[PDB]
Amino acid sequence: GIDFTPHNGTKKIINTVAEVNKLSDASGSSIHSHLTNNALVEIHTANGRWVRDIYLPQGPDLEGKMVRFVSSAGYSSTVFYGDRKVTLSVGNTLLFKYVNGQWFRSGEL
Protein backbone atom coordinates (compact mmCIF):
# COMPACT_ATOMS: atom_id res chain seq x y z
CA GLY A 1 0.00 0.00 0.00
CA ILE A 2 2.87 2.41 -0.85
CA ASP A 3 1.69 5.86 -2.13
CA PHE A 4 3.94 6.62 -5.11
CA THR A 5 3.20 10.35 -5.20
CA PRO A 6 5.96 12.92 -4.69
CA HIS A 7 5.82 15.17 -1.65
CA ASN A 8 5.59 18.20 -3.97
CA GLY A 9 6.36 19.40 -7.51
CA THR A 10 10.08 19.93 -7.09
CA LYS A 11 11.42 17.63 -9.78
CA LYS A 12 14.97 17.23 -11.08
CA ILE A 13 15.41 15.77 -14.52
CA ILE A 14 18.73 14.13 -15.39
CA ASN A 15 18.90 13.97 -19.17
CA THR A 16 22.37 15.05 -20.28
CA VAL A 17 25.58 13.05 -20.83
CA ALA A 18 27.63 14.66 -18.03
CA GLU A 19 24.87 14.02 -15.44
CA VAL A 20 24.14 10.48 -16.58
CA ASN A 21 27.84 9.70 -16.36
CA LYS A 22 27.76 10.41 -12.57
CA LEU A 23 25.16 7.69 -11.94
CA SER A 24 27.67 4.84 -11.80
CA ASP A 25 28.81 6.18 -8.37
CA ALA A 26 28.40 3.32 -5.88
CA SER A 27 26.98 5.67 -3.31
CA GLY A 28 24.52 7.29 -5.68
CA SER A 29 26.00 10.61 -4.60
CA SER A 30 24.58 12.81 -7.38
CA ILE A 31 21.05 11.44 -6.99
CA HIS A 32 21.46 12.00 -3.25
CA SER A 33 22.56 15.66 -3.78
CA HIS A 34 19.63 16.36 -6.15
CA LEU A 35 17.16 14.90 -3.68
CA THR A 36 18.18 17.36 -0.99
CA ASN A 37 16.22 20.09 -2.85
CA ASN A 38 13.77 17.95 -4.87
CA ALA A 39 10.96 15.51 -4.07
CA LEU A 40 11.68 13.49 -7.21
CA VAL A 41 14.63 12.83 -9.52
CA GLU A 42 13.69 11.56 -13.01
CA ILE A 43 16.52 10.02 -15.04
CA HIS A 44 16.32 9.70 -18.81
CA THR A 45 18.89 7.37 -20.39
CA ALA A 46 19.10 7.38 -24.20
CA ASN A 47 21.30 6.28 -27.05
CA GLY A 48 24.61 8.06 -26.53
CA ARG A 49 23.58 8.90 -22.96
CA TRP A 50 23.87 5.71 -20.94
CA VAL A 51 25.73 3.95 -18.22
CA ARG A 52 25.64 0.27 -17.29
CA ASP A 53 25.17 0.42 -13.55
CA ILE A 54 23.14 2.87 -11.58
CA TYR A 55 23.08 2.95 -7.79
CA LEU A 56 20.34 4.43 -5.64
CA PRO A 57 21.72 6.21 -2.53
CA GLN A 58 21.02 5.32 1.10
CA GLY A 59 20.58 7.68 4.05
CA PRO A 60 18.19 9.28 6.44
CA ASP A 61 17.49 12.43 4.42
CA LEU A 62 15.97 10.33 1.57
CA GLU A 63 12.77 9.68 3.54
CA GLY A 64 9.75 9.87 1.21
CA LYS A 65 11.91 10.77 -1.78
CA MET A 66 11.30 9.25 -5.24
CA VAL A 67 13.31 8.29 -8.31
CA ARG A 68 11.86 7.63 -11.76
CA PHE A 69 13.77 6.05 -14.70
CA VAL A 70 12.81 6.32 -18.34
CA SER A 71 15.03 4.44 -20.78
CA SER A 72 15.24 5.21 -24.49
CA ALA A 73 18.70 3.52 -24.60
CA GLY A 74 19.14 0.30 -26.61
CA TYR A 75 21.64 -0.94 -24.05
CA SER A 76 20.22 -2.19 -20.80
CA SER A 77 21.22 -0.86 -17.39
CA THR A 78 21.07 -2.42 -13.91
CA VAL A 79 19.54 -0.31 -11.11
CA PHE A 80 20.79 -1.31 -7.68
CA TYR A 81 18.59 -0.49 -4.72
CA GLY A 82 19.46 -1.84 -1.26
CA ASP A 83 20.03 -5.61 -1.55
CA ARG A 84 17.97 -5.71 -4.80
CA LYS A 85 18.57 -4.97 -8.44
CA VAL A 86 16.37 -4.64 -11.53
CA THR A 87 17.10 -4.41 -15.25
CA LEU A 88 16.19 -1.14 -16.99
CA SER A 89 15.70 -2.04 -20.64
CA VAL A 90 14.79 0.06 -23.67
CA GLY A 91 11.23 1.38 -23.60
CA ASN A 92 10.74 0.92 -19.87
CA THR A 93 9.87 3.19 -16.94
CA LEU A 94 10.77 2.32 -13.33
CA LEU A 95 9.69 4.10 -10.14
CA PHE A 96 11.10 4.00 -6.57
CA LYS A 97 10.20 5.53 -3.19
CA TYR A 98 12.26 5.45 0.03
CA VAL A 99 10.20 4.62 3.14
CA ASN A 100 11.68 4.20 6.62
CA GLY A 101 15.18 3.51 5.33
CA GLN A 102 14.40 1.25 2.34
CA TRP A 103 13.72 1.75 -1.37
CA PHE A 104 10.45 0.29 -2.68
CA ARG A 105 10.02 -0.34 -6.41
CA SER A 106 6.56 0.18 -7.90
CA GLY A 107 5.23 -3.17 -9.04
CA GLU A 108 7.67 -5.26 -6.98
CA LEU A 109 4.89 -7.32 -5.26
UniProtKB/Swiss-Prot annotation:
It is found in: Secreted. It comes from the Bacteria. Induction: Up-regulated by the LEE (locus of enterocyte effacement)-encoded regulator ler. Virulence factor that contributes to intimate adherence of enterohemorrhagic E.coli (EHEC) O157:H7 to host cells. Is able to cleave the secreted human mucin 7 (MUC7) and the glycoprotein 340 (DMBT1/GP340). Also cleaves human C1 inhibitor (SERPING1), a regulator of multiple inflammatory pathways, and binds and localizes it to bacterial and host cell surfaces, protecting them from complement-mediated lysis. Is resistant to proteolytic degradation by trypsin, chymotrypsin, human and bacterial elastase, but not by the fungal protease proteinase K. Cleavage of SERPING1 occurs within its heavily glycosylated N-terminal region and is different to that of elastase. This is Metalloprotease StcE. It comes from Escherichia coli O157:H7. The lineage of its organism: Bacteria, Pseudomonadati, Pseudomonadota, Gammaproteobacteria, Enterobacterales.
